[PDB]
Amino acid sequence: AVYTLPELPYDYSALEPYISGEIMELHHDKHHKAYVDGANTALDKLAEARDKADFGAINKLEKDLAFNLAGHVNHSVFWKNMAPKGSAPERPTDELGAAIDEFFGSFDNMKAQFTAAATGIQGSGWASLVWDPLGKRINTLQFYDHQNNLPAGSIPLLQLDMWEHAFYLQYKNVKGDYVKSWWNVVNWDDVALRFSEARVA
Amino acid sequence: AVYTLPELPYDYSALEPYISGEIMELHHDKHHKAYVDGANTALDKLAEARDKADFGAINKLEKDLAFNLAGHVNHSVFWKNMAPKGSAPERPTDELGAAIDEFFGSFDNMKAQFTAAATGIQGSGWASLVWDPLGKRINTLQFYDHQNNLPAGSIPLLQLDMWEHAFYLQYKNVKGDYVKSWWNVVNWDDVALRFSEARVA
Amino acid sequence: AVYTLPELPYDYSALEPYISGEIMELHHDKHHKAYVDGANTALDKLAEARDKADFGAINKLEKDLAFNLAGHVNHSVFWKNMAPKGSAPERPTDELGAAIDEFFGSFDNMKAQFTAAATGIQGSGWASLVWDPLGKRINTLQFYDHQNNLPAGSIPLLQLDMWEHAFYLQYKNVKGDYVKSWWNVVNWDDVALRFSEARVA
Amino acid sequence: AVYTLPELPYDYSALEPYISGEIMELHHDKHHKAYVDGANTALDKLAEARDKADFGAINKLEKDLAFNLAGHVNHSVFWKNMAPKGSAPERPTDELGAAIDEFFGSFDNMKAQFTAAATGIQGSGWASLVWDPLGKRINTLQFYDHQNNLPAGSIPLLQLDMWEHAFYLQYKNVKGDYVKSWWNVVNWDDVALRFSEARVA
Ligand SMILES: [Fe+3]
Ligand SMILES: [Fe+3]
Ligand SMILES: [Fe+3]
Ligand SMILES: [Fe+3]
C-alpha cells in the first residue's frame, strides 16, 4: 500500500502520567489507523476515476484525500515529537533554540503562544510549530480538523493534537491541563531533526 | 518587512489572449499586495500578543496568518507557474513527465483530474499539483479559499487560482473556458524546477 | 421538481446604476439557476441512496445539499430584498425600525456593523441580518460561502451577496463601493415582511 | 443576560444505560455553559464595536457568535430531544410519522440515512433532521462543528451531538454503538412538537 501505520517509538504507557496508555493505544491503533486506510482508499478511488474518465466525485475524493492524508501526516509527526519524560532534553538548544528565541523572543513566549492556539480552537484541531519556507521563519498555526487553516508548503516541526479523543478520557473538558502535561513529554531532539531537514529546503 | 510582494516575471498583458492584462494588473497590484500586508500585520499582532501576554484574539490572528500567508504563497507560485505561450514547452518532460506518467498514467489524465478539481469547487479555491513527501508521490488537491483542504508539508508544483477575481472579468461564469486557456500559458520549466527541489532530494 | 428558480421581481437593469444589468442577468440566470439544479440533484441522489440502502457518499451528498440549498435560499431572499431606487422607503420603520434601534442602537449603527461584516470576509460569503428565535433578537451574521458560519434556525431578514461574481464586473476589487451602492436598492418593505413572519415564530 | 443555560428536563443519570450521567453532567454543566457565556460575550463585544466604531475584529466576533450561539441552539434542542427510555414512544406517529414516510419512505430509511450522516463526519459535528421551509420538506443535514454545513432558515426537529465529548468516555471510538443506543432515548413527542411549529403553519 502507498501509506502504512508507523509503530510508536515507545510503549503505549511510556508517556504516563502525562498521557495514559489507554489513550495512546486507542489513539494509535484506532484513530491513526483509520487515516491510513482512508488515505489509501482515496488514492485508489482517484485512480479508478482516471481509468473510467469520470471525476464526478472529485470534490468528495479531494476532501477524503486531504482529511485522511493530513490526519496521517499530523499523527506521524505527533508520535515522534514525544518521548518518555527523562529520555530527551527538557529545552530546545543549538540552532533550534536560537531560532525559537529569534522568532518568539524566548522559549516561554513560544510556549505561551502555542498553548493559547491549542486551547482556543473552536472545534477539532491542532496547534503546530512550523517552518515557513517563504518567510524563512518559525510560526505557530492553529489547524482546524487536520487539513484546514494552514498555508501550502508548511513544514511541521512540533504538533499537538487537540481533538477531544486525544485527552478527554484523562483530562475531560480541562484542555489547559492536557497541554501543560504534554510539554513534559516533548522530544526536542526530534523537533531539532525536523527543523534541520526543513531549513535545508 | 517579513513578507514582500514579488514582481511579475513578465508584463501584465504577456499572458494574453489566455489571461487578460486587466485581470493580471488588478490581481497582482491589488489582491496579492493585500495578502502580503495582511500576513505582516498578523505577525505584528502575534508579537504584540506575546509582549503583553494577551492572546485573546489568538483564533483571529492564526486564521489571519493562515489566510494571508497562504494567499501570498499560492499567488507567488501562481505567477512563476505561468509564462507567455511559446516561451515555454507545451508539455512536461524528463523526470517531471515520467513522474506524472507514474502517478496519473499520462499527462492527459493528470490534466483531466486537475481540471475536474478546478471547476468543481464549491466556493473560492485552487486546483493544485503537489508533492506528497510522506507518500513520496505527486497528487492533486482542491484547496478551499487559500488555506483549507490540504495536508501539512504539501509542496506546490503547479497551481491554478479558481477564485472568481482570477477569471470573471474575461470568462464570466464559464470557468471551463478559463481552465482550458490557462493550460496554454503553463511554464513547465518552472514546474520542473519545483519538482526537482521538492523535499530536498 | 422540488426546487424552482424564482423570477426576479423586476427587470435585469432595474437596479442600475447601483448594480448593472449585466451582473443581474449572469447572477440570476447562471449562478442561482445552478444552485436550484444542484439542490434537486442532491435530493435525488439521497433518495437513490435510501432505495439502494447504500449511504457511502453521505458526506458528499450532505455538503451538496447544504451548499446548493443554502445558495438557493440566500439568492431567493437576495432578489426580493431589493427594488428599484425610488420604489420603496429608504429607511426601516414601525416594528422593524424599532427592533433595529433596539438591537443596534440605530439604523446607522446597524449599517456600520453589517458593512464591516460584508467587506471583511476572507473568501466567498454573505452579510446577513437575521432573526434569532432563541434570543428573540436581530443579529448580523457573516456567512462563509453559502452554508457556513450560522446557527440552525436563523431566519434571514436582509442579505448581501459578497461572492465576487456579485460585484467584480462593476466594482472590481473595491468591495466598499459595492456595499455602499447596494444600500440604495434595499427594499425595506420586504425586510419588514420577513421580520413579521419570522417574529411570529 | 441575552442567553441563559436551560436546565435539563431530567436527572443527569436518567438517560442511562444509553448515555452515562458522567457525560451528561460534564456536557451540560461545562460544555453548554461555555457556549452560553461565549455567545453573550460575542454580543457584548459587537455592541462595544458599534459604540467606538471599531469593527477591526468583526470576522472574529461573527464567528464567535455563530459558533457559540449555534452550540447553544444545538444543545438546547439536544436535551429536549431526549428522555429516559419508556417515558416516550419508540417510534414517530401521526403527522410526523406520515411526513417521515413521505420524505424518506419509512422510519427505518430515515434512521439509516441519519445514522450514516452521524458516523461519517470528518471532524466534530451533528446529524440533524430539519424542516426545509423553502422545499417544504424534512431533510437530514450533517453539521460541521456547530455552525457549518447548513442552509439559513433550517428548523431543527431532531439532532444528535457527534462531538467526541458526547460519547468518548462511554463508547470510546465506537461511534456506531453510540448512535444505536441514542435512538432508544429519543423523545418523539418533543420532535413532533417541533415539527408542528416549523414555519408557523
Ligand atoms: Fe488524533
Ligand atoms: Fe487570486
Ligand atoms: Fe451569488
Ligand atoms: Fe456537545
mmCIF file of all heavy atoms in Angstrom, chain B residues 23-45:
data_model
loop_
_atom_site.group_PDB
_atom_site.id
_atom_site.type_symbol
_atom_site.label_atom_id
_atom_site.label_comp_id
_atom_site.label_asym_id
_atom_site.label_seq_id
_atom_site.Cartn_x
_atom_site.Cartn_y
_atom_site.Cartn_z
ATOM 1 N N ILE B 23 -7.024 41.727 -15.756
ATOM 2 C CA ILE B 23 -7.079 40.846 -14.594
ATOM 3 C C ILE B 23 -5.717 40.783 -13.907
ATOM 4 O O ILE B 23 -5.620 41.004 -12.701
ATOM 5 C CB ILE B 23 -7.528 39.415 -14.990
ATOM 6 C CG1 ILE B 23 -9.002 39.418 -15.412
ATOM 7 C CG2 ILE B 23 -7.326 38.448 -13.827
ATOM 8 C CD1 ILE B 23 -9.506 38.074 -15.915
ATOM 9 N N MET B 24 -4.668 40.530 -14.688
ATOM 10 C CA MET B 24 -3.310 40.431 -14.156
ATOM 11 C C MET B 24 -2.889 41.623 -13.292
ATOM 12 O O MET B 24 -2.292 41.444 -12.232
ATOM 13 C CB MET B 24 -2.301 40.245 -15.292
ATOM 14 C CG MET B 24 -2.442 38.939 -16.064
ATOM 15 S SD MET B 24 -2.225 37.462 -15.049
ATOM 16 C CE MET B 24 -0.517 37.641 -14.520
ATOM 17 N N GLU B 25 -3.220 42.832 -13.729
ATOM 18 C CA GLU B 25 -2.836 44.058 -13.014
ATOM 19 C C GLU B 25 -3.601 44.152 -11.691
ATOM 20 O O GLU B 25 -2.987 44.442 -10.650
ATOM 21 C CB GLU B 25 -3.157 45.284 -13.868
ATOM 22 C CG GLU B 25 -2.448 46.551 -13.386
ATOM 23 C CD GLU B 25 -2.560 47.710 -14.376
ATOM 24 O OE1 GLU B 25 -2.640 47.473 -15.642
ATOM 25 O OE2 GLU B 25 -2.576 48.927 -13.946
ATOM 26 N N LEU B 26 -4.913 43.968 -11.716
ATOM 27 C CA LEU B 26 -5.735 44.033 -10.505
ATOM 28 C C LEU B 26 -5.335 42.919 -9.539
ATOM 29 O O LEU B 26 -5.171 43.140 -8.337
ATOM 30 C CB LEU B 26 -7.219 43.865 -10.855
ATOM 31 C CG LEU B 26 -7.979 45.027 -11.500
ATOM 32 C CD1 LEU B 26 -9.315 44.528 -12.025
ATOM 33 C CD2 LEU B 26 -8.179 46.151 -10.495
ATOM 34 N N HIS B 27 -5.159 41.727 -10.097
ATOM 35 C CA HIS B 27 -4.800 40.531 -9.348
ATOM 36 C C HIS B 27 -3.465 40.662 -8.614
ATOM 37 O O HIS B 27 -3.343 40.277 -7.448
ATOM 38 C CB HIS B 27 -4.755 39.348 -10.310
ATOM 39 C CG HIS B 27 -4.942 38.018 -9.652
ATOM 40 N ND1 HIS B 27 -4.888 36.836 -10.353
ATOM 41 C CD2 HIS B 27 -5.194 37.685 -8.364
ATOM 42 C CE1 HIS B 27 -5.100 35.827 -9.526
ATOM 43 N NE2 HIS B 27 -5.288 36.316 -8.315
ATOM 44 N N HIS B 28 -2.470 41.212 -9.302
ATOM 45 C CA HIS B 28 -1.142 41.388 -8.727
ATOM 46 C C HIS B 28 -1.025 42.620 -7.833
ATOM 47 O O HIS B 28 -0.747 42.507 -6.637
ATOM 48 C CB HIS B 28 -0.091 41.450 -9.843
ATOM 49 C CG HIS B 28 1.300 41.706 -9.351
ATOM 50 N ND1 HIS B 28 2.133 40.702 -8.909
ATOM 51 C CD2 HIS B 28 2.002 42.860 -9.221
ATOM 52 C CE1 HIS B 28 3.286 41.223 -8.526
ATOM 53 N NE2 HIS B 28 3.230 42.530 -8.705
ATOM 54 N N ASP B 29 -1.246 43.795 -8.415
ATOM 55 C CA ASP B 29 -1.133 45.053 -7.683
ATOM 56 C C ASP B 29 -2.104 45.255 -6.527
ATOM 57 O O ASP B 29 -1.774 45.940 -5.563
ATOM 58 C CB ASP B 29 -1.230 46.241 -8.645
ATOM 59 C CG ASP B 29 -0.066 46.305 -9.622
ATOM 60 O OD1 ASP B 29 1.068 45.927 -9.249
ATOM 61 O OD2 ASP B 29 -0.286 46.748 -10.771
ATOM 62 N N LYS B 30 -3.296 44.674 -6.622
ATOM 63 C CA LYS B 30 -4.296 44.831 -5.567
ATOM 64 C C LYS B 30 -4.445 43.618 -4.654
ATOM 65 O O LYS B 30 -4.199 43.706 -3.451
ATOM 66 C CB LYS B 30 -5.663 45.184 -6.169
ATOM 67 C CG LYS B 30 -5.663 46.411 -7.068
ATOM 68 C CD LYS B 30 -5.263 47.656 -6.304
ATOM 69 C CE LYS B 30 -5.176 48.859 -7.231
ATOM 70 N NZ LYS B 30 -4.774 50.092 -6.500
ATOM 71 N N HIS B 31 -4.855 42.492 -5.230
ATOM 72 C CA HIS B 31 -5.070 41.271 -4.464
ATOM 73 C C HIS B 31 -3.857 40.688 -3.747
ATOM 74 O O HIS B 31 -3.899 40.492 -2.534
ATOM 75 C CB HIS B 31 -5.749 40.209 -5.329
ATOM 76 C CG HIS B 31 -7.201 40.483 -5.573
ATOM 77 N ND1 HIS B 31 -7.655 41.197 -6.659
ATOM 78 C CD2 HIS B 31 -8.296 40.171 -4.841
ATOM 79 C CE1 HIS B 31 -8.969 41.316 -6.583
ATOM 80 N NE2 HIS B 31 -9.380 40.703 -5.493
ATOM 81 N N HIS B 32 -2.780 40.428 -4.479
ATOM 82 C CA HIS B 32 -1.580 39.862 -3.869
ATOM 83 C C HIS B 32 -0.997 40.810 -2.819
ATOM 84 O O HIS B 32 -0.589 40.375 -1.738
ATOM 85 C CB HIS B 32 -0.534 39.531 -4.937
ATOM 86 C CG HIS B 32 0.526 38.582 -4.470
ATOM 87 N ND1 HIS B 32 1.442 38.012 -5.329
ATOM 88 C CD2 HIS B 32 0.814 38.092 -3.240
ATOM 89 C CE1 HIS B 32 2.246 37.214 -4.650
ATOM 90 N NE2 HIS B 32 1.884 37.245 -3.382
ATOM 91 N N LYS B 33 -0.988 42.105 -3.129
ATOM 92 C CA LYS B 33 -0.471 43.111 -2.208
ATOM 93 C C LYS B 33 -1.191 43.041 -0.861
ATOM 94 O O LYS B 33 -0.562 43.157 0.194
ATOM 95 C CB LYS B 33 -0.626 44.510 -2.805
ATOM 96 C CG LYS B 33 -0.096 45.633 -1.919
ATOM 97 C CD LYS B 33 -0.359 47.005 -2.532
ATOM 98 C CE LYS B 33 -1.850 47.247 -2.729
ATOM 99 N NZ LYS B 33 -2.158 48.549 -3.386
ATOM 100 N N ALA B 34 -2.507 42.844 -0.906
ATOM 101 C CA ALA B 34 -3.320 42.756 0.307
ATOM 102 C C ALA B 34 -2.923 41.570 1.187
ATOM 103 O O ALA B 34 -2.931 41.681 2.413
ATOM 104 C CB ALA B 34 -4.800 42.682 -0.052
ATOM 105 N N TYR B 35 -2.592 40.439 0.566
ATOM 106 C CA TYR B 35 -2.180 39.248 1.312
ATOM 107 C C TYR B 35 -0.847 39.479 2.012
ATOM 108 O O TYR B 35 -0.658 39.053 3.150
ATOM 109 C CB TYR B 35 -2.066 38.030 0.393
ATOM 110 C CG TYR B 35 -3.354 37.662 -0.295
ATOM 111 C CD1 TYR B 35 -3.384 37.424 -1.665
ATOM 112 C CD2 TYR B 35 -4.553 37.589 0.418
ATOM 113 C CE1 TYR B 35 -4.572 37.128 -2.312
ATOM 114 C CE2 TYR B 35 -5.751 37.293 -0.222
ATOM 115 C CZ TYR B 35 -5.751 37.064 -1.588
ATOM 116 O OH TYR B 35 -6.933 36.786 -2.232
ATOM 117 N N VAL B 36 0.074 40.149 1.324
ATOM 118 C CA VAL B 36 1.383 40.453 1.889
ATOM 119 C C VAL B 36 1.217 41.363 3.105
ATOM 120 O O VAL B 36 1.779 41.098 4.168
ATOM 121 C CB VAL B 36 2.301 41.139 0.847
ATOM 122 C CG1 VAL B 36 3.569 41.664 1.511
ATOM 123 C CG2 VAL B 36 2.649 40.165 -0.263
ATOM 124 N N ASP B 37 0.427 42.424 2.951
ATOM 125 C CA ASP B 37 0.180 43.364 4.041
ATOM 126 C C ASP B 37 -0.537 42.685 5.208
ATOM 127 O O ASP B 37 -0.224 42.937 6.370
ATOM 128 C CB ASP B 37 -0.649 44.555 3.548
ATOM 129 C CG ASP B 37 0.085 45.402 2.515
ATOM 130 O OD1 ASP B 37 1.329 45.313 2.425
ATOM 131 O OD2 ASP B 37 -0.583 46.172 1.796
ATOM 132 N N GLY B 38 -1.500 41.826 4.885
ATOM 133 C CA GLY B 38 -2.249 41.117 5.908
ATOM 134 C C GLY B 38 -1.405 40.134 6.699
ATOM 135 O O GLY B 38 -1.586 39.984 7.910
ATOM 136 N N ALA B 39 -0.491 39.452 6.012
ATOM 137 C CA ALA B 39 0.386 38.481 6.656
ATOM 138 C C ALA B 39 1.368 39.179 7.596
ATOM 139 O O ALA B 39 1.662 38.677 8.681
ATOM 140 C CB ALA B 39 1.126 37.662 5.610
ATOM 141 N N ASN B 40 1.857 40.348 7.183
ATOM 142 C CA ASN B 40 2.783 41.118 8.007
ATOM 143 C C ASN B 40 2.073 41.635 9.255
ATOM 144 O O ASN B 40 2.629 41.609 10.351
ATOM 145 C CB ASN B 40 3.364 42.294 7.222
ATOM 146 C CG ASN B 40 4.419 41.864 6.222
ATOM 147 O OD1 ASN B 40 5.199 40.944 6.478
ATOM 148 N ND2 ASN B 40 4.457 42.540 5.079
ATOM 149 N N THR B 41 0.848 42.125 9.075
ATOM 150 C CA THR B 41 0.054 42.640 10.185
ATOM 151 C C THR B 41 -0.231 41.526 11.197
ATOM 152 O O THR B 41 -0.163 41.751 12.403
ATOM 153 C CB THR B 41 -1.276 43.245 9.687
ATOM 154 O OG1 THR B 41 -1.002 44.314 8.773
ATOM 155 C CG2 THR B 41 -2.107 43.774 10.853
ATOM 156 N N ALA B 42 -0.533 40.328 10.697
ATOM 157 C CA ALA B 42 -0.808 39.176 11.554
ATOM 158 C C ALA B 42 0.388 38.861 12.453
ATOM 159 O O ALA B 42 0.225 38.596 13.645
ATOM 160 C CB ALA B 42 -1.162 37.963 10.711
ATOM 161 N N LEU B 43 1.590 38.890 11.878
ATOM 162 C CA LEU B 43 2.802 38.625 12.647
ATOM 163 C C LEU B 43 3.050 39.731 13.675
ATOM 164 O O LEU B 43 3.492 39.456 14.791
ATOM 165 C CB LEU B 43 4.010 38.457 11.724
ATOM 166 C CG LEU B 43 4.020 37.173 10.888
ATOM 167 C CD1 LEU B 43 5.308 37.087 10.092
ATOM 168 C CD2 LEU B 43 3.882 35.957 11.792
ATOM 169 N N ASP B 44 2.769 40.976 13.294
ATOM 170 C CA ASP B 44 2.927 42.113 14.199
ATOM 171 C C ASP B 44 2.013 41.959 15.411
ATOM 172 O O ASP B 44 2.414 42.229 16.541
ATOM 173 C CB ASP B 44 2.583 43.426 13.493
ATOM 174 C CG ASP B 44 3.679 43.907 12.563
ATOM 175 O OD1 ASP B 44 4.791 43.340 12.582
ATOM 176 O OD2 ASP B 44 3.423 44.873 11.817
ATOM 177 N N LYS B 45 0.771 41.554 15.156
ATOM 178 C CA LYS B 45 -0.219 41.363 16.210
ATOM 179 C C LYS B 45 0.143 40.204 17.130
ATOM 180 O O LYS B 45 -0.107 40.263 18.333
ATOM 181 C CB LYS B 45 -1.605 41.138 15.606
ATOM 182 C CG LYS B 45 -2.527 42.340 15.708
ATOM 183 C CD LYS B 45 -1.947 43.559 15.016
ATOM 184 C CE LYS B 45 -2.832 44.782 15.212
ATOM 185 N NZ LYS B 45 -2.984 45.145 16.650
#
